[PDB]
Design an enzyme around this catalytic site. Structure first.
Site, short mmCIF file in Angstrom:
data_model
loop_
_atom_site.label_atom_id
_atom_site.label_comp_id
_atom_site.label_asym_id
_atom_site.label_seq_id
_atom_site.Cartn_x
_atom_site.Cartn_y
_atom_site.Cartn_z
N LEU A 165 51.48 26.28 33.17
CA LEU A 165 51.54 26.76 31.80
C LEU A 165 52.22 25.81 30.81
CD1 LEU A 165 52.09 30.69 32.28
CD2 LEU A 165 50.11 29.55 31.14
N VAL A 200 48.79 31.91 40.40
CA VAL A 200 50.22 31.61 40.20
C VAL A 200 50.50 30.78 38.90
CG1 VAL A 200 52.25 30.89 41.43
CG2 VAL A 200 50.21 31.51 42.68
N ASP A 201 51.13 31.42 37.91
CA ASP A 201 51.31 30.84 36.58
C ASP A 201 52.70 30.26 36.63
OD1 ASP A 201 48.94 32.17 35.81
OD2 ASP A 201 49.98 33.57 34.43
N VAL A 202 52.82 28.93 36.48
CA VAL A 202 54.11 28.25 36.61
C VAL A 202 54.65 27.89 35.24
CG1 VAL A 202 55.40 26.31 37.67
CG2 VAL A 202 53.42 27.30 38.90
#
EC number: 5.3.1.16
Length: 235
Positions: A45, A8-10
């Site tokens: 990120l 999960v790239d936030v």
């Protein structure tokens, strides 16, 4: 690949929605937990690229859900490490900074032990595996040093597999698994369900996990599918 971790790239408080667009990390996490997810891999990120931080949203996720969280992105000094830890992350990954601060990383492994994984990105060049650091050195010397300093866990990434349909570099991963007592997380290049299965085959050598982003979000297979297919091997 004993265990599978969806990525999960936030950014700006949002993550990619598993469709059938973007929503909250919580929603993603809930949607992944539904499917048998026992661990989630979160990338901050904004912290990885110096644009900000999403630490308080992470702390909300660990507060609200009883799921193991690996957290990475911009962990590079004591201040960032603290704020990573303050999140409630089960485990935290340190990348480039670990190669550039050998004494700092020993120091942190000493204090934190199993909360620390070191993320090593590698590139093959002219027949030698070189830590695609910021360089960072020879892969095998780096491993030996880190191993000797008590590192509990490595995350290894061949920097080419990101294109997804090669496969992950199993011959490298098996070599790394043989070179250290620390268990290995395969990351980078998952294309098909059989890629997961080729990895889990070697779980007993020390490859006990895989991180998976794209393959999951582009609906190549579902998480429940992969978890059962890895069960089917177990037996």
């Amino acid at each position: 690949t004993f265990t599978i971790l969806p990525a999960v790239d936030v950014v700006n408080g949002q993550a990619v929605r598993l469709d059938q667009s973007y929503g909250t990390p919580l929603e993603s996490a809930l949607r992944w937990q539904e499917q048998g997810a026992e661990w989630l891999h979160f990338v901050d990120l904004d912290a990885a690229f110096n644009r900000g931080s999403n630490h308080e949203l992470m702390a909300e996720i660990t507060r609200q859900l009883d799921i193991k969280v690996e957290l990475t992105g911009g962990i590079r000094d004591d201040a960032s490490l603290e704020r990573a830890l303050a999140t409630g992350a089960t485990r935290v990954n340190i990348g480039t900074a670990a190669l550039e601060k050998p004494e700092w990383i020993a120091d942190v492994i000493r204090r934190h032990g199993e909360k620390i994984a070191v993320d090593i990105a590698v590139r093959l060049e002219n027949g030698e595996w070189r830590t695609k650091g910021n360089d960072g050195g020879d892969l095998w010397e780096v491993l030996e040093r880190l191993d000797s300093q008590g590192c509990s866990r490595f995350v290894v990434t061949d920097v080419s597999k990101d294109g997804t349909l090669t496969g992950p570099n199993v011959d490298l991963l098996r070599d790394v698994a043989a070179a250290t007592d620390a268990p290995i997380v395969a990351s980078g290049g998952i294309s098909t369900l059989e890629d997961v299965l080729g990895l889990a085959k070697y779980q007993d050598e020390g490859i006990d996990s895989v991180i998976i982003g794209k393959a999951l979000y582009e609906h190549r297979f579902t998480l429940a599918e992969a978890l059962e297919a890895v069960e089917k091997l177990g037996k």
